């Protein structure tokens, strides 16, 4: 569904794309981890930011 | 190096004694002493990370 919609979005908006699966395998949540004492996003949300 | 507590871990012990005696009602009062950034930030962080 989403790849067909992405091909449509690319064609109308005239951009090229490179698709890659998220390494984490997660959709994305804010996790403190506490290693850096600060919250960070994982999943696809982290990759975008 | 020093044999001294940190501001953060002193705040951690503050919450530990609150947990044992079930003191969950908070109030932070601080001044412009150069450690107020770190004192309340550590306390705020632990509040959001527990059930």
Swiss-Prot record, chain A:
Subcellular localization: Cell membrane; Postsynaptic cell membrane; Postsynaptic density membrane; Synaptic cell membrane
Post-translational modification: NMDA is probably regulated by C-terminal phosphorylation of an isoform of GRIN1 by PKC. Its phosphorylated state is influenced by the formation of the NMDAR-PPP2CB complex and the NMDAR channel activity.
Recorded superkingdom: Eukaryota
Glycosites: 14, 34
Domain-related comment: A hydrophobic region that gives rise to the prediction of a transmembrane span does not cross the membrane, but is part of a discontinuously helical region that dips into the membrane and is probably part of the pore and of the selectivity filter.
Record note on quaternary structure: Heterotetramer; the NMDAR subunits are modular and harbor tiered domains that function in concert to regulate opening and closing of the cation-selective ion channel pore. Forms heterotetrameric channels composed of two GluN1/zeta subunits (GRIN1), and two identical GluN2/epsilon subunits (GRIN2A, GRIN2B, GRIN2C or GRIN2D) or GluN3 subunits (GRIN3A or GRIN3B) (in vitro). Can also form heterotetrameric channels that contain at least two GluN1 subunits and at least two different GluN2 subunits (or a combination of one GluN2 and one GluN3 subunits) (in vitro).
Disease with which this protein is associated in UniProt: Neurodevelopmental disorder with or without hyperkinetic movements and seizures, autosomal dominant: An autosomal dominant neurodevelopmental disorder characterized by severe intellectual disability and developmental delay, absent speech, muscular hypotonia, dyskinesia, and hyperkinetic movements. Cortical blindness, cerebral atrophy, and seizures are present in some patients.
Role this protein plays: Component of N-methyl-D-aspartate (NMDA) receptors (NMDARs) that function as heterotetrameric, ligand-gated cation channels with high calcium permeability and voltage-dependent block by Mg(2+). NMDARs participate in synaptic plasticity for learning and memory formation by contributing to the long-term potentiation (LTP). Channel activation requires binding of the neurotransmitter L-glutamate to the GluN2 subunit, glycine or D-serine binding to the GluN1 subunit, plus membrane depolarization to eliminate channel inhibition by Mg(2+).
Family: Belongs to the glutamate-gated ion channel (TC 1.A.10.1) family. NR1/GRIN1 subfamily.
Listed name of the protein: Glutamate receptor ionotropic, NMDA 1
Shown residues within the full chain: 458 to 506 of 938
From Swiss-Prot, chain B:
Subcellular location: Cell membrane; Postsynaptic cell membrane; Cell projection, Dendrite; Late endosome
Superkingdom of origin organism: Eukaryota
Expressing tissues: Primarily found in the fronto-parieto-temporal cortex and hippocampus pyramidal cells, lower expression in the basal ganglia.
Entry comment on modification after translation: Phosphorylated on tyrosine residues.
Complexes and interactors: Heterotetramer. Forms heterotetrameric channels composed of two GluN1/zeta subunits (GRIN1), and two identical GluN2/epsilon subunits (GRIN2A, GRIN2B, GRIN2C or GRIN2D) or GluN3 subunits (GRIN3A or GRIN3B) (in vitro). Can also form heterotetrameric channels that contain at least two GluN1 subunits and at least two different GluN2 subunits (or a combination of one GluN2 and one GluN3 subunits) (in vitro). In vivo, the subunit composition may depend on the expression levels of the different subunits. Found in a complex with GRIN1 and GRIN3B. Found in a complex with GRIN1, GRIN3A and PPP2CB.
Role: Component of N-methyl-D-aspartate (NMDA) receptors (NMDARs) that function as heterotetrameric, ligand-gated cation channels with high calcium permeability and voltage-dependent block by Mg(2+). Participates in synaptic plasticity for learning and memory formation by contributing to the long-term depression (LTD) of hippocampus membrane currents. Channel activation requires binding of the neurotransmitter L-glutamate to the GluN2 subunit, glycine or D-serine binding to the GluN1 subunit, plus membrane depolarization to eliminate channel inhibition by Mg(2+).
Family from the record: Belongs to the glutamate-gated ion channel (TC 1.A.10.1) family. NR2B/GRIN2B subfamily.
Disease implicated: Intellectual developmental disorder, autosomal dominant 6, with or without seizures: A disorder characterized by significantly below average general intellectual functioning associated with impairments in adaptive behavior and manifested during the developmental period. MRD6 additional features may include seizures, hypotonia, abnormal movements, such as dystonia, and autistic features.
Domain notes for this protein: The extracellular N-terminal domain (NTD) endows NMDARs with a unique capacity for allosteric modulation, harboring several binding sites for small molecule ligands that act as subunit-specific allosteric modulators of ion channel activity.
Protein name: Glutamate receptor ionotropic, NMDA 2B
Lineage of the organism: Eukaryota, Metazoa, Chordata, Craniata, Vertebrata
Boundaries of the shown chain within the full protein: 144 to 194 of 1484
């Amino acid at each position: 569904f989403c790849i067909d919609l992405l091909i449509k979005l690319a064609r109308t908006m005239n951009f090229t794309y490179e698709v890659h699966l998220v390494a984490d395998g997660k959709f994305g949540t804010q996790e403190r981890v506490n290693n850096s004492n600060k919250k960070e996003w994982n999943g696809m949300m982290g990759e975008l930011l | 190096f020093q044999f001294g507590p940190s501001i953060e871990q002193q705040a951690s012990v503050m919450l530990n004694i609150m947990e044992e005696y079930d003191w969950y009602i908070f109030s932070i009062v601080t001044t412009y002493f150069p450690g107020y950034q770190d004192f309340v930030n550590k306390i705020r962080s632990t509040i959001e990370n527990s059930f």
